[PDB]
Structures are given as structure tokens and as C-alpha cells.
Design a protein around this ligand. Structure first.
Ligand SMILES: Nc1nc(NC2CCCCC2)sc1C(=O)c1ccc2ccccc2c1
Length: 282
């Protein structure tokens, strides 16, 4: 490339190929994302202003030769791989707590600036050797619009609501929290209806009592089976009651009842939070 030198392909992201690259002028290593609209350019450019320790920095937006690239700060591992690498022993609770706390700070920051992610998943949660965890790709979904993982999708999205709110990110993070604890995805659906029914089988089929307005959602069908809610203690053992209480608030059906990132940071679960060093094999 004219301005970068590719080191290697990292993988296929939501919007195009992602490469580990080196800036020719500075020598800095970055995550270069090729995007496969004028409104998009202006909107994404605004995201360069975001700066928070728990957000992967968007270093630049490059629009040349009628191609679009996003340059992001590079991190050495994502949470998906770290979880796989920690499958035999599990991620220590203090580290799970630290990561969840940091992720909520990242969400609280973005949300306060009116920026949603909409597609949080272990793949876009990046970690470094110092114990930090950061979220990548906030705001891209809105700017760009429309096999993809549905495992972390909020129910309102699965039910066809086309108006998103900050709550969709809290739902996704709750699912990730559960996965770090049990070492298994919470709702590993293989289709949109399977995803929805896995949620219903665990949390109970929603109704107008727990979710006012649910029966009027675009894809809601009166024919959905009626499953009873499972005992929460069976879903994420052996997470303690503070952890279970917080998780339940992040997984409320009604997005308006779902806890905010800001309020979650004050939950008793974080009374003893610390910042442990993870053991990363790079
Ligand atoms: N900043 C940043 N550093 C990265 N280093 C890699 C971490 C995992 C191990 C190899 C280096 S990956 C990254 C992303 O921002 C990012 C996020 C989601 C992705 C989903 C699918 C494919 C690529 C993706 C890349």
C-alpha cells in the first residue's frame, strides 16, 4: 500500500477485511479495516474525537482511490481467544470483574456521547498485557447501516424493532459476562428464531406484564410457545448473588427496565473490584 505495509490478515470483520499493518511514515503498528456514502464519512470522522481508556482508538478515516479504510489502535488479543485459551481453568473471578467493570465504563462513556455499538461480541473486545480491555467499533453500525453471530443480540432487535437504544449494548455485555463465568455461550442460537427461542426457554417467554408493548413488536407472533422462566441460579453457577443480581438487571426483557452502564458501575458486585494482570500467550 502507498501509505501502509501489511503485516498479515487478521480476519474478516463486519464491514470488510482487517489487517495488521505498519504506517510507513511513523512505523506504528495498527489494525487497518477495509470497508467493503458521504454521510458515513462525516459521521465516522466524528468518532475520531472519542477518547477513553476502554475504547479502541479510531486513529484515522482514510478515503483515497475511492476506497474507505479505518485505522484503529492495535491490541494483541481479543476476548474470544482469551476465553478459549482460559477454557480449562476459567478466567479468574477478579479478572472477570475487572473486565466487566472496564467494559461498563466504556459503554457509559459512549452512551453519554450518544454513540451505540449495537454488535458487541467477544471478537470486538480487545485486551492488552496490562489488564485493560477495550471495545472496538462503537458507532459503526449507525454510520454504515446494513456468517454473523446472533448470540449477543438483544430481544427487541430479534423481534424486529428498528429503533435501537443504549439497552442493546447492556444486553450484549450481560451475555458476555455470563459466558466469561460459565465458559459457555449463554444463548448460542443458529438462526434468528432459534436465538429468540433459546432466550425464551431460559428467561421465560415474555408477555405484556414483564414487557409492556412486546406483543406489538414487528415480528412478535401470538403463536410463540410459552416457556416458564428458569431459576436464575441454574443459569450461571457458581456466580455469587451480587453477580447474579447484576446480570439479571442487564438481561431484563424491556430495554427500558434494563440497567444503564452508569448505574451498573455502582452495583454492589463491584465493591471489591481490582485490576489484575492477565496471563496472555502472544
Ligand atoms: N484493534 C484491533 N486489534 C486487533 N488485533 C488482533 C487481536 C486478536 C489477535 C490478533 C491481533 S483486532 C482489532 C479490531 O479492532 C477488530 C475488532 C473486531 C474484529 C472482528 C473480526 C475480524 C477482525 C476484527 C478486528
Amino acid at each position: 500500500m502507498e501509505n501502509f505495509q501489511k503485516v498479515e490478515k487478521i480476519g474478516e470483520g463486519t464491514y470488510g477485511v482487517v489487517y495488521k499493518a505498519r504506517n510507513k511514515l511513523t512505523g506504528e503498528v495498527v489494525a487497518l479495516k477495509k470497508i467493503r456514502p458521504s454521510t458515513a464519512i462525516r459521521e465516522i470522522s466524528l468518532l475520531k474525537e472519542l477518547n477513553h481508556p476502554n475504547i479502541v482508538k479510531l486513529l484515522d478515516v482514510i478515503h483515497t482511490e475511492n476506497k474507505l479504510y479505518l485505522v484503529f489502535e492495535f491490541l494483541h488479543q481479543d476476548l474470544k481467544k482469551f476465553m478459549d485459551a482460559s477454557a480449562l481453568t476459567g478466567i479468574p473471578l477478579p479478572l472477570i470483574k475487572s473486565y466487566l467493570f472496564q467494559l461498563l465504563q466504556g459503554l457509559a462513556f459512549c452512551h453519554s456521547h450518544r454513540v451505540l455499538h449495537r454488535d458487541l461480541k467477544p471478537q470486538n473486545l480487545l485486551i492488552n498485557t496490562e489488564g485493560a480491555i477495550k471495545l472496538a467499533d462503537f458507532g459503526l453500525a449507525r454510520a454504515f447501516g446494513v456468517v454473523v453471530t446472533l448470540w449477543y443480540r438483544a430481544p427487541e432487535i430479534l423481534l424486529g424493532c428498528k429503533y435501537y437504544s443504549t439497552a442493546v449494548d447492556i444486553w450484549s455485555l450481560g451475555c458476555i459476562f455470563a459466558e466469561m463465568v460459565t465458559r459457555r455461550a449463554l444463548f448460542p442460537g443458529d438462526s434468528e428464531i432459534d436465538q429468540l427461542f433459546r432466550i425464551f426457554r431460559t428467561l421465560g417467554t415474555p408477555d405484556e406484564v414483564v414487557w409492556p408493548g412486546v406483543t406489538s413488536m414487528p415480528d412478535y407472533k401470538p403463536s410463540f410457545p410459552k416457556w416458564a422462566r428458569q431459576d436464575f441460579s441454574k443459569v450461571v453457577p457458581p456466580l455469587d448473588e451480587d453477580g447474579r443480581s447484576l446480570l439479571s438487571q442487564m438481561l431484563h426483557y424491556d430495554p427500558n427496565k434494563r440497567i444503564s452502564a452508569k448505574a451498573a458501575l455502582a452495583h454492589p458486585f463491584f465493591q471489591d473490584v481490582t485490576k489484575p494482570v492477565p496471563h496472555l500467550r502472544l
